[PDB]
Design a protein around this ligand. Structure first.
Ligand SMILES: Nc1nc2c([nH]c(=O)n2[C@H]2C[C@H](O)[C@@H](COP(=O)(O)OP(=O)(O)OP(=O)(O)O)O2)c(=O)[nH]1
Ligand code: NA
Ligand code: NA
Ligand code: NA
Length: 156
């Protein structure tokens, strides 16, 4: 089994809208996404999620809610991406464009799935229903899923 590297993903989800960012470069460029990145040495996963939210969007939050975990495998890449997914409904400040991301709010009847990673179609609806989930997706490149598993869980 491949080694895995820790990543975070943070969704600011309010009652009628969600904050996404347009990835300007790097992994997932050109796709809307939550904010996040590699967990660093010495921080908890939740603290790494808070840090990435602040670095990529300018927003601070004191606390996050863990809602899911998704493991990504890419054909031809040796490491799995172990993505820990967090939400919050309570933000301090305004989103700001970073080098990584251009922020944009979307209404919850206008989730831009066509410009999001294909796997988000499966797990994002669970997040919106306040369910907790574990997922795994194997990709060939950026567009093709070869295998996946998704389960609703009571405890992440
Ligand atoms: N919604 C969604 N998010 C994903 C998928 N795959 C995936 O890695 N992510 C998230 C996890 C991270 O938030 C982000 C990947 O991390 P990143 O490459 O931006 O990490 P980073 O900010 O440390 O990278 P960098 O500045 O060094 O380039 O994308 C996916 O299929 N769907
Ligand atoms: Na980052
Ligand atoms: Na990032
Ligand atoms: Na899509």
């Amino acid at each position: 089994m491949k080694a895995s590297r820790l990543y975070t993903l943070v969704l600011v989800l309010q009652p009628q809208r969600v904050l996404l960012g347009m990835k300007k470069r790097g992994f997932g460029a050109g796709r809307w996404n939550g904010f996040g990145g590699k967990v660093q040495e010495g921080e908890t996963i939740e603290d790494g999620a808070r840090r990435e939210l602040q670095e990529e969007s300018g927003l601070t939050v004191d606390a996050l809610h863990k809602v899911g975990q998704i493991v990504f495998e890419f054909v031809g890449e040796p490491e799995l991406m172990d993505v820990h997914v967090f939400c919050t409904d309570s933000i301090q400040g305004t989103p700001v464009e970073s080098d990584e991301m251009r922020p944009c709010w979307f209404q919850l009847d206008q989730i831009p799935f066509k410009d999001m990673w294909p796997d988000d179609s499966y797990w994002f609806p669970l997040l919106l229903q306040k369910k907790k989930f574990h997922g795994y997706f194997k990709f060939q490149g950026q567009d093709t899923i070869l295998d996946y598993t998704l389960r609703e869980v009571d405890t992440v």
